[PDB]
Amino acid sequence: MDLASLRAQQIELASSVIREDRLDKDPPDLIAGADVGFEQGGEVTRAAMVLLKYPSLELVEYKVARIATTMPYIPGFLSFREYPALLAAWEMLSQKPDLVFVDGHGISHPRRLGVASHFGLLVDVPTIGVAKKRLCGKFEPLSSEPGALAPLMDKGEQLAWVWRSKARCNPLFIATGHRVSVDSALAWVQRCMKGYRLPEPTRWADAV
């Protein structure tokens, strides 16, 4: 069972996610944005990484990796196909960021191991999940103003902050990836806003 040991790996990694602040460099000098997806109906995994300066939020570099998908889609295990592409893009970076924002779920994931937690943990860098849609859990519907804020709850636990970053946009689901608390994850995303729906690092990562 490659399937039973996949599952085993998963619950171990979910266990090892750090849910408290552990930045080695606060404030960061350099942050990064990350995006992953699939091309060729799943045969190629593509990941984009972006480096910005903090606090300016200036683009200084970006890199795209494309690799062949080696694992097929298996429900619950998307982070294992996504992870290798993010790793490849990461290793193209000419310097390493102090904090990483991933376009995707942190612990706010059925298995507590969204791609942002998966990546953050294997690479061991402070990481935040900035997701565009709910995956699991529940929240009190948000009022329509910018700054509307509700906790995302599952099983008695807060997995994320649901935060309307911008008027007339759908909200963000901001969760710890690795080595960032849920409340600091929100704080850091808010610090990395300019005038769009997404914070700059993942906006940039999607744009390249």
Take residue 168 and report the two structure tokens written for it.
Answer: 């007339």
160: domain CATH number is 3.30.2170.10
In angstroms, rounded to a whole number, what is the distance separating the alpha carbons of residues 24 and 28? 8
3-class state of residue 186 by DSSP: helix
Task: Name the β-bridge partners of 52.
Answer: 31, 59
In angstroms, rounded to a whole number, what is the distance separating the alpha carbons of residues 162 and 149? 6
**157-163, strands of its sheet edge to edge:** 59-68, 44-53, 30-39, 99-102, 127-131, 172-178, 157-163, 149-154
Q: Residue 186 sits in which domain range?
A: 1-208
Residue 53 phi, psi (nearest 5): -80, 145
Give helix then strand counts, H and E, for the chain.
5, 8
In angstroms, rounded to a whole number, what is the distance separating the alpha carbons of residues 157 and 123? 26
| Data resolution in angstroms | 2.4
Is 145 within 8 Å of 126 (Cβ atoms)? no
Residue 192 phi, psi (nearest 5): -105, 20
Closest C-alpha to 81, from 126, 47, 129, 121: 47
3-class state of residue 81 by DSSP: helix
Amino acid at 176: T
Q: Where are the beta strands (DSSP E) in the chain?
A: 30-39, 44-53, 59-68, 99-102, 127-131, 149-154, 157-163, 172-178
Instruction: List the determination method.
Output: X-ray
Q: Which residues make up each annotated binding site? A: 35, 103
3-class state of residue 13 by DSSP: helix
In angstroms, rounded to a whole number, what is the distance separating the alpha carbons of residues 131 and 101? 10
Q: Which residues make up each annotated binding site for Mg(2+)? A: 35, 103
Q: How many domains does the chain have?
A: 1
Residue 9 phi, psi (nearest 5): -50, -45
Take residue 117 and report the two structure tokens written for it.
Answer: 């937690």
Task: Name the β-bridge partners of 154.
Answer: 157
